[PDB]
């Protein structure tokens, strides 16, 4: 649908996130050495086929691995070190972070592999807007947001004197989270890695970094152009047309039909080469202005929403801890045949109480599980309230009376006794 700038608000959040962590957890492949069991600090590989989802050993934090399938010969280790040192320091919200590059023989061919942070169920803009059903048709606002975030990446990358490269095309930049959060991926490491000579000492002629630095502007122009133009093809379900710097002409961006003329000016600035370009983040942003307020606004809005939904849910963690501890204490094998845990013993009330909360009898005839019962019992126990509960043995002749506080103290004492 079309909305004001609430823009980062997704249609169904709980479904999305649950599906996300679920997607994170899944590992199918095992047997074959087509995909090896363990690589360096990385294991539990699943294909996404040159590209895998992996669980690290060191972090234990899921990451993704890119295979980069064949290499002529042994890589000069110093170059790898250069790649790592250079890109590990850079931090950007809209650029997926680079954690570790390495060279391995484990594929039984000579492969060099990259590792990136995981952003599950992320799809490329190509897939998101045009092909994948149902497709959300690019609204000018969203386009503006896209432009702003990519611009952010431009600023962050250029500020550290590096060029992003020819990866600015839409298919290589994916979206993370359904509605608006954008991130790009690869950044053309191939230039720095596969070159025999880059000594980063310019002669009087000067460095070649600037030219590429402008090229990035041009590529951004290409992406945004293609998206902006294929809008009608998006609204009605249809296949897109692709364009390039070579193919792109200003007469057509002026001949565009639904676009804010401001965006036309921006695209014009990006795509055009001038006798003196000297393109800076400053000028382009001078074109931008308020759209930054748009993305920030949407961002804050989403934050507020998430806080709101989180508020309802926050208590459950505590409950998790409680049931976890009680569960730890209750059924241990050694505890099964102990005299203490018997019908006459100190520990017996624990079994009786646990039975009371979790094991319910309907009309004395069958089991039922009431949730509010469980929460009430657990909460009251956690609070340690002086209130009395009457428990049955149940050889039905005699009974025991116990207060929630005493239950609390007893349970913690038992747990501490088991542990340490």
């Amino acid at each position: 649908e079309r909305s004001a700038d609430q823009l980062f608000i997704p249609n169904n959040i709980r479904e999305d996130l649950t599906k996300k962590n679920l997607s994170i957890l899944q590992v199918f492949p095992s047997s074959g050495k087509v995909i090896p069991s363990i690589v360096q600090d990385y294991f539990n590989l699943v294909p996404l086929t040159t590209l895998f989802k992996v669980f690290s050993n060191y972090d234990g934090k899921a990451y993704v691995l890119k295979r980069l399938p064949n290499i002529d010969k042994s890589m000069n280790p110093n170059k790898i070190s250069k790649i790592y040192q250079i890109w590990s320091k850079i931090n950007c919200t809209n650029l997926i972070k680079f954690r570790d590059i390495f060279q391995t023989t484990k594929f039984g061919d000579l492969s060099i592999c990259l590792v990136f942070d995981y952003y599950p169920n992320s799809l490329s803009l190509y897939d998101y807007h045009f092909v994948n059903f149902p497709k959300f048709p690019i609204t000018n606002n969203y386009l503006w947001i896209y432009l702003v975030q990519l611009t952010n990446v431009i600023n962050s990358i250029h500020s550290q004197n590096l060029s992003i490269g020819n990866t600015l095309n839409w298919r290589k930049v994916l979206i993370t989270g359904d509605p608006g959060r954008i991130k790009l991926s690869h950044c053309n490491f191939m230039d720095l890695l596969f070159n025999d000579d880059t000594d980063t000492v310019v002669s009087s002629g000067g460095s070649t970094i600037e030219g590429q630095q402008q090229l990035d502007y041009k590529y951004l122009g290409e992406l945004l152009f293609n998206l902006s133009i294929n809008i009608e093809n998006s609204n009605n379900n249809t296949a897109p047309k692709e364009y390039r710097l070579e193919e792109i002409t200003p007469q057509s961006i002026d001949d565009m039909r639904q676009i804010d003329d401001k965006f036309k000016d921006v695209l014009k600035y990006l795509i055009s080469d001038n006798g003196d370009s000297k393109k800076s983040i400053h000028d382009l942003t001078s074109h931008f202005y308020d759209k930054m307020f748009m993305v920030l606004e949407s961002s804050q809005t989403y934050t507020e929403y998430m806080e709101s939904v989180l508020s309802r849910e926050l208590e459950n963690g505590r409950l998790f801890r409680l049931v976890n501890k009680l569960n730890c204490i209750f059924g241990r094998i050694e505890s099964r045949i102990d005299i203490n845990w018997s019908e006459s013993g100190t520990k017996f009330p624990i079994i009786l109480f646990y039975d009371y909360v979790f094991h319910q009898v309907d009309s004395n005839g069958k089991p039922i599980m009431d949730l509010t019962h469980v929460l009430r019992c657990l909460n009251k126990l956690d609070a340690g309230i002086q209130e009395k509960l009457m428990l049955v043995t149940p050889d039905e002749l005699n009974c025991i009376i116990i207060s929630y506080k005493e239950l609390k103290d007893l349970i913690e004492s038992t747990f501490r006794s088991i542990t340490q």
């Binding site: 019962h373 340690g384 609390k408």
Partner: protein, 683 residues
């Protein structure tokens, strides 16, 4: 009463909400006011479990017999351990990185650390190992073993057995005869000869390991059953290996010419097992076993009761008998009749017992006295403490192999041993970790207090027998026949030796060898340029050629020219650098093909024993891959000091021609001539 709805809690709720309802938030019932800490508060415990790298005559059940379609019931030692235990966590990055020299040379031999929990440098993992000479690690006269073999942990065990006088002297003794049919006994004999001969530098177990691996292609069923990082899993394996090795060696010592069966007497335990039940009728069996496995319940002061129970115990297992098919809990009672000259202890215990052992002081007894009374073996610390026939055997601790788990929670094995010094009538204690050897004090040797150390295998020997001296093979008269004759299980020509030439101390012979790679060295490179070598290179012997050195050059006829025919499914034959068929495999190989079975190795070894000097383009690489080392007296070779090494084919043209594919005999011959040049060239 308590049943829903109770008046206590449920009284507010009109109907039950199901646990599966997502519309109903958990926050729905607030906690009341609390003046004290919540139960849900979690104590300051560290969590090490996440990011753990996975994988490092009866059936069914007794009382568990109520089952669904699902269960398959085999368990314990083979897979995991005590029920639902969390696996320890090891991080690979920390595992493969650590050592160059360690940055330390001199302080590495210190076996004691002030911290109780801290693992001393000596026990720490030693670096892996062109050619590098590690001097500082061993100051003793007793050789250490190389860590690089197919599975290195075995070394720990072997070194132990090396110091058992009966074992060593016997196995080295069996070298006197051929005994080619027995792989393990012989190869172990040669290995023993290596560790014995060189009062000095290290020896490798490679040929032993290879032979063993080839062999595995009732005890065999057991070790195969236990069988499936590459090196990582000591899980329960070393115990099993002890049993397999001992038993197999007994099986093989039968096959020797004399049928000496000395091991059968020395490690032999008569085990009497009586089964009491019906439908089996009655069954009683007696079988000789090499080692006893220790388990137990207290029903202590020190180790001895465990041993006693191991020697006489009655246990109840649920069995189905082949006699009559009635399946029921059956009771078996087993007692051992005799006390061996040497006994080996395999420790399989609940880890809790290991804890309790760590708690006790001097739990392992340096020495004990024992004898049998009634049908019941009894073992006590002092002669008077037991009353009886006063026919008592004195058992002293010969040695033991212990597992070490360092702070990184990786696992390695180490050997503690005791050696007699005849002069001064003294005992010395030594620790062997791979190629590291340290002379250590008794108090440290017996101390079980350390948390990382766990006992695995313990070997006890008779006091009188232990003090008997070690004897090298040199005392025995040795069979030289394989030198003088031919055994082959096509080459153009060669001439076997006769009795006239008399190779002896001073004799000159020439040799060269050619190898084939069983595995390729594979590297992994992380950031910051660290070469991680995973899957080390495995190389096997391919061809060996030895030619006569008598009267200077003289005869051009080879003493022996042999192909070894070993099939491990080679990766690459290195045909370019050395001519290899391929297809030297026994069934289809047209060449004189001999299973190495030490035989070529026997030729070279009997040669070096006799002390005949060796000639070659270089001795070291070849001999290193032959898994034999020879003193510098025999060592002399052509290659001379130059800005590493010198290449022979290069030098040939300089000394006056050369070809791409070079037979080994050619290199050896040219080498011999080059040595002849080197002598007369003098200044």
């Amino acid at each position: 009463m308590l049943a829903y709805p109770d008046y206590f809690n449920d009284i507010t709720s009109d109907g039950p909400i199901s646990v599966d309802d997502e519309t109903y938030p958990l926050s729905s019932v607030g906690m009341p006011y609390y003046l004290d800490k919540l139960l849900s508060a979690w104590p300051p415990v560290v969590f090490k479990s996440e990011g753990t790298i996975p994988q490092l005559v009866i059936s069914s059940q007794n009382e568990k017999l109520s089952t669904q379609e699902f269960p398959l019931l085999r368990y314990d030692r083979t897979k995991y351990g005590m029920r639902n235990a969390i696996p320890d966590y090891v991080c690979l990055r920390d595992i493969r990185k650590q050592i160059t020299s360690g940055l330390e040379t001199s302080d590495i031999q210190t076996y004691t650390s002030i911290n109780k929990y801290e693992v001393p440098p000596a026990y720490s993992r030693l670096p892996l190992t062109d050619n590098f000479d590690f001097t500082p690690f061993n100051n003793t006269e007793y050789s250490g073993l190389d860590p690089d073999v197919d599975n290195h942990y075995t070394n720990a065990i072997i070194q132990l057995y090396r110091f058992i006088p009966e074992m060593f002297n016997f196995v080295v003794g069996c070298l006197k005869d051929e005994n080619f049919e027995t792989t393990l006994l012989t190869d172990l004999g040669y290995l023993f000869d290596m560790m014995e001969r060189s009062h000095g530098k290290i020896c490798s177990s490679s040929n032993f390991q290879a032979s063993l691996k080839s062999l595995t292609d009732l005890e065999s069923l057991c070790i195969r059953e236990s069988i499936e990082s590459s090196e990582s899993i000591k899980r329960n394996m070393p115990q099993k290996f002890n049993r397999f090795l001992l038993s197999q060696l007994i099986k093989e010592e039968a096959q020797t010419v004399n049928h000496n069966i000395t091991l059968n007497q020395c490690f032999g335990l008569e085990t009497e097992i009586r089964t009491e039940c019906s439908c089996d009728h009655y069954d009683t069996t007696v079988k000789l076993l090499p080692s006893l496995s220790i388990s137990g319940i207290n029903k202590g002061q020190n180790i001895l009761p465990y041993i006693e129970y191991a020697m006489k115990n009655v246990t109840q297992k649920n069995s189905i008998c082949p006699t009559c098919g009635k399946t029921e809990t059956i009771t078996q009672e087993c007692t051992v009749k005799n006390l061996p000259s040497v006994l080996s202890l395999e420790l399989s215990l609940l880890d809790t017992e290991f804890s309790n052992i760590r708690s006790s002081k001097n739990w392992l007894t340096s020495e004990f006295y024992g004898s049998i009374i009634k049908n019941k073996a009894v073992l006590r610390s002092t002669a008077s403490e037991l009353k009886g026939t006063s026919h008592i055997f004195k058992y002293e601790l010969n040695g033991y192999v212990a597992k070490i788990t360092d702070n990184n929670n990786e696992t390695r094995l180490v050997t503690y041993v005791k050696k007699y010094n005849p002069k001064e009538n003294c005992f010395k204690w030594l620790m062997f970790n791979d190629y590291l050897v340290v002379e250590i004090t008794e108090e440290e040797a017996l101390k079980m207090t350390y948390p990382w150390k766990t006992p695995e295998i313990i070997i006890y020997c008779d006091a009188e027998e232990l003090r008997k001296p070690f004897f090298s093979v040199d005392t025995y008269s040795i069979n030289y026949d394989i030198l003088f004759r031919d055994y082959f299980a096509a080459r153009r020509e060669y001439k076997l030796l006769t009795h006239d030439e008399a190779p002896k101390s001073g004799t000159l012979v020439a040799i060269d060898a050619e190898f084939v790679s069983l595995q390729s060295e594979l590297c992994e490179i992380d950031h910051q340029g660290i070469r991680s070598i995973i899957r080390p290179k495995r190389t096997a012997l391919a061809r060996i050629s030895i030619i006569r050195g008598e009267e200077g050059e003289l005869y051009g006829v080879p003493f022996v020219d042999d192909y070894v025919v070993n099939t491990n499914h080679i990766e690459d034959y290195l045909t370019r650098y050395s001519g290899i068929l391929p297809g030297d495999l026994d069934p289809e190989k047209s060449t004189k093909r001999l299973v190495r079975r030490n035989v070529v190795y026997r030729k070279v070894w009997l040669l070096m024993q006799l002390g005949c000097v060796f000639v070659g383009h270089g001795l070291n690489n070849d001999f290193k891959h032959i898994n034999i080392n020879v003193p510098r007296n025999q060592i002399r070779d052509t290659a001379i000091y130059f800005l590493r090494y010198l290449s022979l084919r290069y030098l040939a043209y300089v000394l006056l021609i050369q070809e791409g594919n070079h037979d080994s005999i050619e290199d050896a011959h040219t080498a011999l001539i080059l040595y002849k040049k080197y002598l007369h060239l003098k200044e």
